[PDB]
Design a protein around this ligand. Structure first.
Ligand SMILES: CC(C)(COP(=O)(O)OP(=O)(O)OC[C@H]1O[C@@H](n2cnc3c(N)ncnc32)[C@H](O)[C@@H]1OP(=O)(O)O)[C@@H](O)C(=O)NCCC(=O)NCCSC(=O)c1ccccc1
Ligand SMILES: CC(C)(COP(=O)(O)OP(=O)(O)OC[C@H]1O[C@@H](n2cnc3c(N)ncnc32)[C@H](O)[C@@H]1OP(=O)(O)O)[C@@H](O)C(=O)NCCC(=O)NCCSC(=O)c1ccccc1
Ligand SMILES: Cc1cc2c3c(c1C)C(C)(C)C[C@@H](O)N3c1c(nc(O)[nH]c1=O)N2C[C@H](O)[C@H](O)[C@H](O)COP(=O)(O)O
Ligand SMILES: Cc1cc2c3c(c1C)C(C)(C)C[C@@H](O)N3c1c(nc(O)[nH]c1=O)N2C[C@H](O)[C@H](O)[C@H](O)COP(=O)(O)O
Ligand SMILES: [Ca+2]
Ligand SMILES: [Ca+2]
Ligand SMILES: [Fe+3]
Ligand SMILES: [Fe+3]
Ligand SMILES: [Fe+3]
Ligand SMILES: [Fe+3]
Ligand SMILES: [K+]
Ligand SMILES: [K+]
Lengths: 514, 514
């Protein structure tokens, strides 16, 4: 039980071989140093901390998915478009996970069944100095089998263990865990599930997915999609205590039960005066400071991990980082692409969810109309995307002469290609939204800022595409950037001196010439 | 007549002293090489071409205003906010221009009164290979005195001299030249004006202004604003033939008359079949390929210039460059700031028109609400900006915790802070727009794409501001980027290796920590 063929340690070895690994040996605080160093180097190389404060048996990795280029190099993709198409193909073709014995799983070298103090072994962090609680935000849930209709689910859930071996368990309403909890709410037996830590990067990648249930409904095989992404099946193992399955190649696994009707407060102040949605609880995906709520409790029965002499790795990450944004929006991009290809194939060329929009709030699709009969399909695509995403606030459709990765080019399409009377779609006013957007706090009024009181404004679908047959009038003004060579006119020093000053939309426009 | 104290040559000497000047000696074509080399190095250092093809007496400068940092260093401003405030102050305090004699003006060393072939002396360029005509797009008009109500006007006008000494003269409807032409349309005497070339950079800066006539109405002193910007009065000189005044420190001056009722076609193909708004005429400010129209004719009576042995400099520039964008939108930014400060002072903090939006299509203002009584002033500001700009299509108001120079941060505010039911303003449907936007071609139908047939959709004012009293719920999630020092944990090599991979919104977020 010491090999994990494709896991976090092999990924660290590949990162060290490629030269992408930044590793230090100095003792780092989980309090306001890991997330601070992650935000200082946001969207960059992975950082490995060998020594963690008050965690003598644990290492810590961060910014693992921060640069999307090294992630695409890890999984063998050339660019983001190839990544989107390959992960859509992997969604439609899962690899069924294999079950190995309880003696070759590396996560079951040490099995703690007593003295269950989760905060002693797992590294809880604080993100900002405005917080009061150190929370565990590193684990993915793992529901395999009868509670997920014979499929499998992996996904992140934040936990605050402020009762020793009992901690809160934050569930987004509408998610797979919400659907499992809603089905088994009125039950006597609690839901058995495991929280896995230091998982293979494919499992992190698929655990980022969410609110894409027209493509990945309840009963799908998310671990199958992770196995299809890494190109080999993800190994499972039966738990020691509960009746479930874990990722065998993880670094830590918490086994236990979820009690849905046992709801407790996440912080001490919101418990002190009984108010959800007011007190600060570590910044959220929307790009604002989060709020503390009531949440069901996760009753840990066993802590299994690797050997503490091997120093198992945990992956703590801040929420408003490019790390967290890549983790969610990559597989959500390919799911949106899959839905638009299902509705009408051959029209959508590329789907991109930038860091700027949010995890769950926005997307940009790029359509190409081949004839007059395909005119109008972008409005079907925008309405279907906004309806099938639960609280996406802004979907933008652009034409094929646009750089989809530049927000300056998107703003140019918003300025020049949008009729404000006809091209703004508000499809579903009064539907379901995401309560973590404070624009829905503005609709709750003086009631409690919970999901029961918010009112969705309906989303915003912006059709910034060129009408068919008007491609000559909306033609983009390509210059002669390949008809002239600057090496004739200037030397190397003038050329790189002028090239060092360019940044952004000029860098996008100088490649394309438009 | 050989000194111009603040002019283009002194600016070139200062650029060479600062090391910002890139100069070559190889013979460059005005056909598809100058604009190509400008787009290859878009938004960068100035380029000086000593040898121009078929122009043995002329030098050519380009990308002079391409980097806004070297422009702010030239005029003595620290950042863009200081530039906006100082140019607003200079707008409210002009320096009256001085008139010097006809023998100390350096632009009147050589006075050609016969053999007036404008294309022989002035460099006409072609931008894209899709064009057929080589046009002159380097000169600014100069109307001083009785035709501009005792004030002065400077502004660019494109000209195509396809009749020897008679060329077209493109006037935007609504502009100062349009107001002068509209007042003197039914007159027998033509309007006398001069086209000045190679002007001081302050005159280029103020000549970029347009459609800001609540702040700079007809009868204002635009040359006074140029003198206030450079800090010394701009010298004028009486013309040799016509009854007007020119910029004395220019490099070339065309003297002549504008005939408003003598309208001719700009290209040969649109003249060949009598259609405005269809055939390609060198890309425009909207970011599309332009169209050819009918335009009044400029009848050149005299060409005055510097000594041809001194090789006078002309400034040809492509239209969809950061050069052209800085030239217009800088003074238009300060004019929008001045209007918002006039309506209610102390609320607008910063105004920015990025390259991405357009010259005349968009702006971003940044407001700060000090109390509850100032809530709602951003909607007055958006409506006033959209009404007083003639065809601005998209105005966005953001709060003060936003980086106004990052379009990713603006897109984040569009995703998270806009109610699509209440925060989208469409103030003036059916007003006046700009015909060069093809979104107004979509409203002309099968009539002619002219300004007489377009129908404005009304503009789009987006209130992406935080409501007052909800700053705690919309609080931005500042991390500890100054509580931890990366020099402790890593060496220099790991630090700059990680810093070299960051670009864009991560660069904006890693300074601020949010
Ligand atoms: C939505 C709840 C849970 C509603 O609680 P409250 O309003 O306080 O109301 P109650 O709790 O009292 O229950 C009401 C009554 O209805 C019943 N009933 C309830 N549920 C069920 C059910 N499932 N099934 C069946 N029935 C159910 C039940 O009978 C109950 O009555 P009892 O209990 O029997 O007396 C609220 O706590 C909340 O706002 N949570 C936060 C929402 C959120 O957005 N989390 C996002 C995290 S993602 C983010 O971290 C992230 C994302 C990406 C990257 C990074 C980060
Ligand atoms: C707007 C016009 C000029 C209208 O012409 P048409 O539709 O063909 O119609 P007509 O010409 O036949 O005249 C109609 C009748 O009305 C009368 N009348 C007319 N005018 C006046 C008057 N002023 N005053 C009084 N009356 C006037 C007159 O009586 C006339 O009848 P007649 O003539 O007596 O029989 C059109 O040619 C056009 O679309 N131009 C392009 C517009 C444009 O946007 N240019 C933008 C350039 S900026 C860009 O380059 C840039 C910006 C930043 C950076 C970089 C680059
Ligand atoms: C990448 C990432 C995602 C999430 C979270 C974090 C990270 C790093 C935390 C720091 C732990 C903070 C919280 N958190 C979190 C969460 N979803 C929840 O229901 N509950 C949570 O407390 N999402 C999004 C999940 O990853 C989604 O997968 C979502 O759970 C839906 O997934 P699914 O049901 O469709 O399968
Ligand atoms: C910077 C720049 C601006 C302009 C132009 C060019 C450049 C480089 C050309 C390449 C020559 C192409 C055209 N062109 C142009 C033009 N305005 C016109 O009425 N007519 C024109 O043919 N503008 C905008 C003018 O600079 C504005 O100043 C406008 O003229 C309003 O100015 P004003 O009336 O308010 O004073
Ligand atoms: Ca993404
Ligand atoms: Ca600008
Ligand atoms: Fe799931
Ligand atoms: Fe459109
Ligand atoms: Fe003017
Ligand atoms: Fe708002
Ligand atoms: K998931
Ligand atoms: K002007």
């Amino acid at each position: 039980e010491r090999v994990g063929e494709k896991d976090l340690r092999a990924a660290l070895e590949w990162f060290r071989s490629k030269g992408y690994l930044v590793e230090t040996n100095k003792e780092v605080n989980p309090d306001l140093e890991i997330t601070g160093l992650q935000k200082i180097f946001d969207g960059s190389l992975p950082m490995l901390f060998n020594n963690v404060k008050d965690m003598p048996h644990a290492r810590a990795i961060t910014n693992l998915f921060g640069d999307i280029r090294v992630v695409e190099e890890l999984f063998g993709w050339e660019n983001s478009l190839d990544r989107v198409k390959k992960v859509a193909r992997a969604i439609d073709h899962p690899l069924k996970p294999v079950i190995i014995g309880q003696d070759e799983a590396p996560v079951q070298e040490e099995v703690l069944t007593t003295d269950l103090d989760v905060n002693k072994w797992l590294t809880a962090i604080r993100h900002t100095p405005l917080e009061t609680e150190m929370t565990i935000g590193s684990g993915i849930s793992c529901v395999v089998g009868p509670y997920f209709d014979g499929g499998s689910h992996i996904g992140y859930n934040r936990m605050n263990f402020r009762w020793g071996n009992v901690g809160t368990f934050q569930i987004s309403p509408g998610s797979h865990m919400w659907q499992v909890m809603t089905e088994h709410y009125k039950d006597d037996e609690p839901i058995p599930l495991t929280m896995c830590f230091g998982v293979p990067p494919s499992c992190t990648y698929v655990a980022g997915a969410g609110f894409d249930y027209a493509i990945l409904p309840k009963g799908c095989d998310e671990i199958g999609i992770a196995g299809a992404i890494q190109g080999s099946p993800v190994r499972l193992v039966k738990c020691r205590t509960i009746d479930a399955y874990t990722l065998a190649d993880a670094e830590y696994v918490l086994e236990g039960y979820l009690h849905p009707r046992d709801k407790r407060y996440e912080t001490a102040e919101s418990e002190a005066a009984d108010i959800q949605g007011r007190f600060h609880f570590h910044p959220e995906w929307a790009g604002y400071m989060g709020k503390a709520y009531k949440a069901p409790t996760f009753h840990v029965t066993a802590i299994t991990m690797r050997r503490r002499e091997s120093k198992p790795i945990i992956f703590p990450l801040g929420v408003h980082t490019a790390d967290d944004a890549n983790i969610d929006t990559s597989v959500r991009e390919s799911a949106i692409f899959a839905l638009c290809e299902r509705l009408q194939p051959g029209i959508v060329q590329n789907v991109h969810i930038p860091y700027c929009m949010t995890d769950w709030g926005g997307c940009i699709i790029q359509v190409k109309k081949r004839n007059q009969i395909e005119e109008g399909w972008q409005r079907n695509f925008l309405a279907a995307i906004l309806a099938c995403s639960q609280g996406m606030r802004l979907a933008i459709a652009v034409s094929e002469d646009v750089d989809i990765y530049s927000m300056d080019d998107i703003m140019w399409c918003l300025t020049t290609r949008v009729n404000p009377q006809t091209d703004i779609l508000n499809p579903l006013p009064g539907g379901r939204g995401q309560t973590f957007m404070p624009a829905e706090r503005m609709t709750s009024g003086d009631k409690q800022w919970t999901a029961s009181n918010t009112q969705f404004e309906g989303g915003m679908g912006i059709d910034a595409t060129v009408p068919y047959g008007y491609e000559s009038d909306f033609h983009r003004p390509v210059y002669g950037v390949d008809l002239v060579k600057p090496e004739n006119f200037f030397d190397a020093k003038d050329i790189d001196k002028m090239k060092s000053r360019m940044a952004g939309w000029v860098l996008s426009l100088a490649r394309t010439g438009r």
